[PDB]
Amino acid sequence: KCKPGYHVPGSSRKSKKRAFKTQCTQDGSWQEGACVPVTCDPPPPKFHGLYQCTNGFQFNSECRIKCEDSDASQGLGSNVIHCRKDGTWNGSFHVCQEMQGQCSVPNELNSNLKLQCPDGYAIGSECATSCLDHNSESIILPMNVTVRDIPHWLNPTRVERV
Numbered sequence: 001k002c003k004p005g006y007h008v009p010g011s012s013r014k015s016k017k018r019a020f021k022t023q024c025t026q027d028g029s030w031q032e033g034a035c036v037p038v039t040c041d042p043p044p045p046k047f048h049g050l051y052q053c054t055n056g057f058q059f060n061s062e063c064r065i066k067c068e069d070s071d072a073s074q075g076l077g078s079n080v081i082h083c084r085k086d087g088t089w090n091g092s093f094h095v096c097q098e099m100q101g102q103c104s105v106p107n108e109l110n111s112n113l114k115l116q117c118p119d120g121y122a123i124g125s126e127c128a129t130s131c132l133d134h135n136s137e138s139i140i141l142p143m144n145v146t147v148r149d150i151p152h153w154l155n156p157t158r159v160e161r162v
Contacts, residue, residue, distance in 0.1 A: 002035035005059040005085060009036040013087055040083035046124060047093050051081075059083050067096035099123065106162075113138055115162065126161045 002008060007016035016038065022031035038059035043051055053063040061083045070076070077094020084090055103121045117127040129138035139156040141147065150156065 005038055006035040007038050009034055016087065038083070038085075038087065040087055040089055043081065043089075043093055046095075051093065057083060059085065063089075063093075065093045065096075068098055070096045070098075112136055128161055129159050 002018040002020075007018055008020045011017035018035075020033050020035075022033050025031060037055075040057045040059070040061065042057050043063055043065075047065055051063045051065040053061055055061050057063070062080060063082075064080045067079055070079075077096075078091040079093070079096075081089040081091040081093060101123045103123055103125065105121055106115045106127070109115060112131045112133060114130050114132060115127045116130055117125065119125040119127070121127075131138055138159050140159055141150065141156050142154075145151070145154060
């Protein structure tokens with residue numbers, strides 16, 4: 001049985017299996033078993049690069065978003081979120097007052113990579129990442145792998161927006 005705040009890796013999120021079994025294998029060993037510390041979902045992407053988490057998004061993970069000149073006597077939002085047993089954060093990150101403005105036009109762009117911005121170039125605005133070739137996908141490759149240097153087993157992450 002997994003400890004409280006722990007579940008078998010790969011368990012369903014709706015019912016995180018806290019109990020598993022091991023068996024005397026034919027080679028004289030036992031079946032492998034583990035209980036990961038659970039992992040709540042990451043905070044919303046709009047706060048990327050702004051919150052620091054104690055141990056990632058695990059159970060009872062304390063993620064604090066950095067804000068300035070936001071007094072606690074006003075009682076607006078919460079800057080700290082803690083992951084719970086069920087797989088949820090006890091609090092929610094709130095947008096502070098010191099986040100406003102527009103964004104620069106993406107002049108630096110690849111020949112195939114186009115950015116369509118019906119929402120202008122505001123801060124927090126979503127710009128769709130499209131390609132001139134209809135069968136081309138806008139992705140980020142790891143810094144150690146270039147466009148030609150993609151291994152057959154590598155699966156680059158898809159970037160549908162910026």
